[PDB]
Symmetry: C4
Subunit: 331 residues, 4 copies
């Protein structure tokens, strides 16, 4: 073995991230303005725009969930607050029309009662929200929800970063699998635990377990540019979940911050010291202020539409078949 020892499987793969690849142009009859951007969030739910907002207390409360739904995507309400308050944010969203909404739950002792209160409030999607879903307690929660409320509610499980973990969630009955262990902009799991998986390779592996069973993959974390959305979907994901890219919008929670003559908003990991209030796996930081959500979403979808034009992809299902070129450090 060229890199050491006598076991070829010790270093199991070469992991690529978004910056390691570009989409190749292909024969096209598609105008960007005419592409169909709709895609499956879950087995039963299709969104007009393939984007959802992170379940974080500096990204998604009621106002963000309403704006995301109106723009054709969806919000996932965070769970760092009392059960009755999260349930009330669900009703606030449903009171603003027939708008789709999701909400996060954990696997702790209070997680089941939270899930039932969210169901009573009319939630459309429950997200079993963990850092490591390849675990019996998490698989059991997904299965119990699906068997109990699965006719009226779609159940998402995550997060995973390997083929085997994605396969286990499929078997447990997940309606979608969420992919991302380590890639987030505010994540320190890579340096604190030494654990992670570059996202392009993680998506390719998860899709190999999920697509043959008709289960959509949500790419969660590490997306820095509108072009990364196109890359994640071409690797086989059906939607992307965004934190940093939406945290700078007017609709996110938290105050406007002025430093050195420039405007920012606070953005913090749910594993940071501040959010937990210990060995933190996130930081508390800030992102540039970007203006209204509707305008940010227009620009992000605009980049996706351009990629669909260059690759000849009339639908997101066609984009999932596009090819990459791998690039070097120089490029």
């Amino acid at each position: 073995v060229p890199t050491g020892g006598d076991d070829p499987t010790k270093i199991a793969m070469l992991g690529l991230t978004f910056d390691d690849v570009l989409l190749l142009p292909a024969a096209s009859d598609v105008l960007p303005a005419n592409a169909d951007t709709s895609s499956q969030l879950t087995k039963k739910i299709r969104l007009k725009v393939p984007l959802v907002s992170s379940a974080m207390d500096t990204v998604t409360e009621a106002r963000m969930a309403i704006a995301m739904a109106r723009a054709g995507g969806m919000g996932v309400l965070h769970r760092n607050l009392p059960v009755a308050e999260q349930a009330a944010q669900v009703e606030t969203v449903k009171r603003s029309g027939g708008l789709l909404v999701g909400a996060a739950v954990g696997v702790g002792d209070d997680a089941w009662e939270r899930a039932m209160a969210l169901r009573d409030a009319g939630v459309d999607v429950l997200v079993v929200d963990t850092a490591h879903a390849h675990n019996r307690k998490v698989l059991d929660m997904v299965h119990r929800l699906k068997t109990t409320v699965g006719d009226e509610i779609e159940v998402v499980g995550g997060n995973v970063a390997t083929r085997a973990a994605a396969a286990a969630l499929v078997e447990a009955g997940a309606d979608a699998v969420k992919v991302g262990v380590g890639p987030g902009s505010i994540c320190t799991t890579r340096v604190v635990a030494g654990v992670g998986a570059p996202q392009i390779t993680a998506i390719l592996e998860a899709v190999a377990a999920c697509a043959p069973h008709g289960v959509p993959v949500i790419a969660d974390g590490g997306l820095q540019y509108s072009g990364d959305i196109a890359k994640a979907l071409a690797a086989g994901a059906s939607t992307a979940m965004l934190g940093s890219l939406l945290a700078g919008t007017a609709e996110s929670p938290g105050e406007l911050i002025l430093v050195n003559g420039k405007q920012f908003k606070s953005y913090r990991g749910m594993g940071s010291l501040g959010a937990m209030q210990l060995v933190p796996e996130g930081i508390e930081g800030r992102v540039p202020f970007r203006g209204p959500l509707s305008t940010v979403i227009h620009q992000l979808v605009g980049g996706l539409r351009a990629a669909m034009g260059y690759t000849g992809s009339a639908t997101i299902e066609e984009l999932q078949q596009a090819q990459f070129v791998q690039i070097t450090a120089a490029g």
Copy 2:
């Protein structure tokens, strides 16, 4: 598959850019001062110097086209202005002697009338000027021009970055194929759409489709140093098109700018907000002021001549047979 999934073709190639390679020295009888730098721009047109200026409104209007022709190259007049004005710039150039000139046209509804007005003005070369030529509307335009005015005018099509796209332009009747999707200094297509192709690999692939049919390749975008001209031609291109490297010259349009005691000129993408006046795929920037064009061209051709000496290349056709070494990040 070491990088993920079960499909070896998903990541189709490893793409190299100019900074990834160097030309290897070889046995030589050639003095730099005695090399023959002439090369085919198109099937019928041979230039004394293998260089043309970009069709951009901060690079090429009448003054630049006149200076480029006198230096032994050619200018391509931009199309971001009324038809009658572009046609008048063509006549201005022809009034300064028997000087070669080209002009860009699109594929929109007004593109045919623009092309006919340019023909009436005495243009030598028409460039069908798009970001993605692998498309029936673009192929149809190239073919219609060649069948209509092709006896008196040479027709260039572009841009492409794959073997299959280059092959389609050849079949449509192109007299030259222009290569470059994503590499430009002011380009944001890579980050906005996630689309592109590193230029050395793009040129190697396009040449594999074009050279067997006797059709010259124009390398367009990403050239930062005089040494990159030699690299592009050794990869098999016949000429190079330059934007950033000529935008700082006296003959380019736009004002001299003074910031922090240093002189600059404005340089902007044709896909920037300013040029289009939306999801922009270019930026508005600036480049250092470089002085007269004739002097810049002397230095660029001087570097090319040095490469021809080191590689034993008496002509550009011989340089197209030179070999590379691939280098690492450290180098």
Copy 3:
């Protein structure tokens, strides 16, 4: 041979460092709080926490050795002082309870008398402390110690960075093998001599010689983050030795330094000019002040515990079987 010459063995391997790899998540029944972090320092000695402090005069004297033992690890007392003084630091530690302690010795003419004085003082571990253990004088010292005092004292030999060197120490009778030639934060051997071996590959190679003989490997140098501890142990090491990461603690020797409104402590190589008082192979630098040792160790072990959770490793022996993904520059 693609990289030059006709000998495939001239460039013998591709060496990976900690930053080149991440640990992959795996199926897990393990909670971080419930993992067993105990591990073999030597054939006979098992520590509660798999960490020891460097034998350096800005890292480990009596106070550090006492604090390390109380936290469940061990200190190795430096040898840059008179024999009678080092022996007295050993007794100081033993006077603070039944605490484990080690001490460094060289291979010079005074090394044997130093070793005997340390034995008389009640030392638990002798570390034969060199930059290059693949040498007859060093192997002879290890063997002579083991045959003379080996029933009551465990003998460590180092440092090495190849399979063959580790194998030689095993044959000589070492109770543990210490790995690291070139990787230290304050090391200049790589630039002064041009010699070294990236640590992940060095650990994989040393373990291939040591594990089949039941001899533990100590990973020494280059560890910058708590996550690097998990990586070193997963590559097959049984403990890690830390210099820079503990030099900023209250218990290390040396004064608090204030520069630009920030607090630091001095940290210097044992091969720096200052420590030797010549061709130095270390620098004299500084590290940020970090507070009490007990608190730093809590955070480091916290990161290790997180890695054990993500990888499903109930013990350090299970962690030694975990898998890596290799990452690129971009990642």
Copy 4:
């Protein structure tokens, strides 16, 4: 072909530079202080220290040549001055004892008379001094010198960077071959012409042609640290030529410069505008002031001695058999 086109030989090799490799430690009986650092400069001439100074007008005139010889190496006098003046510097050196000295000559019309005047002055080594020796005029000059004055004078030819070019100089009768096209610290050939060859690979290739014929290789350019000397010799070179590393010494030509409270000396390429007084292939820069030559040489040889200890190399001939590990960007 993964990187483009259909020709596997177009990208002929992967080129490594000094920063891409480290020397692996090996079994050793060698103390650094006891290593034998002597090595062949040419077929007949052996130096006590394997180092020579560059033929540059900011590195080597009489004073530097005298100091280099006394330190056990040799100086090569530059040729950017009148013939009678260069010949007088040779006699100045010979007047300071029985000291070895070399001098550069070109291949222009005045080169033969320069060579004869240097011979009359008592020069020991003539260096045919070009940027590209794979050329009939250069090969003819080497052969004519060897056949005319070869009994009393050793003849060096260079520079080359390929196996075939080195082989041609051997056939022409060279007593040593000098390797380096593009690597120098003040070189811009890589960016101006796009031509070069990373030095480790260039040395491995040149040695494959020269060592079977008993002809020594001089590694010229790109050496930045004392450790790079050990790397060049392990790749198979017999000596190293130094420019930047000796330009900062008291004995080099040119004035002490004070900028921002720090001391520097001027250092310029022989292809810079200033030296030629045009398309320059070098820059005019500065290096930190380093003090007396004897002290710099002591430190450089000290690093070499350390490498010989780590690798078990008793002589330079043994060091030429040492092995490398290739490292990544991270390392």
